[PDB]
Amino acid sequence: KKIIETQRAPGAIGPYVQGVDLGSMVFTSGQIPVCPQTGEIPADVQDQARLSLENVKAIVVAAGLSVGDIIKMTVFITDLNDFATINEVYKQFFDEHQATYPTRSCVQVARLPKDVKLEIEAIAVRS
Amino acid sequence: MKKIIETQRAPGAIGPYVQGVDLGSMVFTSGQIPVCPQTGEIPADVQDQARLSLENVKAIVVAAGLSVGDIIKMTVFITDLNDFATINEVYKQFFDEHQATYPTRSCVQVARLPKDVKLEIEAIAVRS
Amino acid sequence: MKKIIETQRAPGAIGPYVQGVDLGSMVFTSGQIPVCPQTGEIPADVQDQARLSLENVKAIVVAAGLSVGDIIKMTVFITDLNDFATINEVYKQFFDEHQATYPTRSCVQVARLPKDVKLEIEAIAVRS
């Protein structure tokens, strides 16, 4: 049960840690497209998708793991019109790390913290 | 242990995901929607939709060497809580049919789901 | 080891699910809504609702021989983000009171929750 803390993901606002490392398994919090330095949210969905993804990556790498060890994601979205765009980014993100795609759920919710267009949580394994 | 689960008995991974992953001790499925594995059709009735997602979950869990009775956790994202009595009747019947202990569950009403399905079901199965 | 968890300190199961599953290394809870185990009722105020879901989670985790400080991941499903600051405050004091480090967390606003409660909270806890 080790806590994960990285400056390459946005710092914890409220009463949660960025990640927890259980030994075999790493769980991230839901990541939103907040810039870890500036605290800013990009306006385009394609930039939001990339930034949530990077924020997930940061926590997983801080645990000593890679993109390729992510086995499950959930993508919470606010607008299905954004779906093909989010998918393209999500695909390029995995391809660039030469990593097979995780398992995945994807649901459109009513609203997300800070009115972002998406939120991504992950589960990675050590081997 | 990481092994990708791939089956013709569940609908083909359309976008950037795999249907299931087998970690040895645990199996995770992608969220299963009511898409017919052979025809790509979405049944119109919520009873048939409920039944079809559960069957798709089954197909992936079985392709891993497991069964429905190994399912320990499900999340059931739905678009109408008024459908809930019917979903729940189908869902009870499914575990019963398979002589399976009921898993833990969360059920929430979301805004909308891929391909305008009424439910999406993700599952976690353990080996022993 | 697939042990069903059963406690009277959380509302009894109302359908095809169990309150919790103990796998040995981890414990998964069903999604907990703010129904009082003794009255079957829902308090109107969201601080009360948040506290109660959290107590209900704790009742199951504790039935497995674990404690609040062993909870590693929560998903908080809410129907109104305007409730969020209030829910956080209650959620934080809950963990502080138990001297527990905060779990990882996802928080989304859904459209509707069973019995029209304001939030629903599921958990995962680990033994070691």
Author numbering:
A (entry chain C): 2 to 128
B (entry chain A), C (entry chain B): 1 to 128
Direct quotes from the study:
The location of this gene within the tdc operon is strongly suggestive of a role in the degradation of 2-ketobutyrate. Each 14 kDa subunit comprises a single domain that contains a predominantly anti-parallel, six-stranded β-sheet against which are packed two short α-helices. The most significant structural features are the three symmetry-related solvent-accessible clefts, located at the interfaces between pair of subunits, close to the "equator" of the trimer.
The original 2.35 Å resolution as-isolated X-ray data set was collected at 100 K using a cryoprotectant solution containing 20% (v/v) ethylene glycol. During model building and refinement, it became apparent that whilst the electron density in site A was consistent with ordered water molecules, a more substantial region of elongated density was present in both sites B and C. This could be modelled convincingly as a single ethylene glycol molecule in each of the two sites making a single hydrogen bonding interaction with the side chain of Arg-105. It was noted that the central part of the loop connecting β1 and β2, which delineates one side of the cleft and bears the conserved residue Tyr-17, had elevated temperature factors, with Ile-14 being poorly defined in the electron density maps. In our initial structure of TdcF, the cryoprotectant ethylene glycol was shown to occupy two of the three binding sites, but this is unlikely to be physiologically relevant.
